[PDB]
Design a protein around this ligand. Structure first.
Ligand code: 0R3
Length: 92
């Protein structure tokens, strides 16, 4: 994952926007660096990720699960994460 991908501008779909607004100000367009930070913040504040449970995020009991279509995922599989995130946004 090139660092250039983080500058990419995107517009979250309704569900993802609903998630993002619980941790950050609503915007029409976000850079991927913002989307990833806010998503990562949403995960930590809701403790869907216990750093003690070996890099796996558990989201079957959260909207995040409905967004990503999975019950859990590793914080280390970044390409998979990006694909799941793209399913929920539209590139500018
Ligand atoms: C939820 C944990 C979060 C913390 C806040 O930085 N996080 C990590 O813990 C990491 C250090 C896990 C790792 O690769 O070892 C980085 C991770 C991340 C950062 C930028 C892009 C991606 Cl796809 C993942 C990143 C992350 C960000 C968003 C999601 Cl959806 C998942 C993981």
């Amino acid at each position: 994952i090139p660092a250039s991908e983080q500058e990419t501008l995107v517009r979250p779909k309704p569900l993802l926007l609903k998630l993002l607004k619980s941790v950050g100000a609503q915007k029409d367009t976000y850079t991927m660096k913002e989307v990833l930070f806010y998503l990562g913040q949403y995960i930590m504040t809701k403790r869907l990720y216990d750093e003690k449970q070996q890099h796996i995020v558990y989201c079957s009991n959260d909207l995040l699960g409905d967004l990503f279509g999975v019950p859990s995922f590793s914080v280390k599989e970044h390409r998979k994460i990006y694909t799941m995130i793209y399913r929920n946004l539209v590139v500018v």
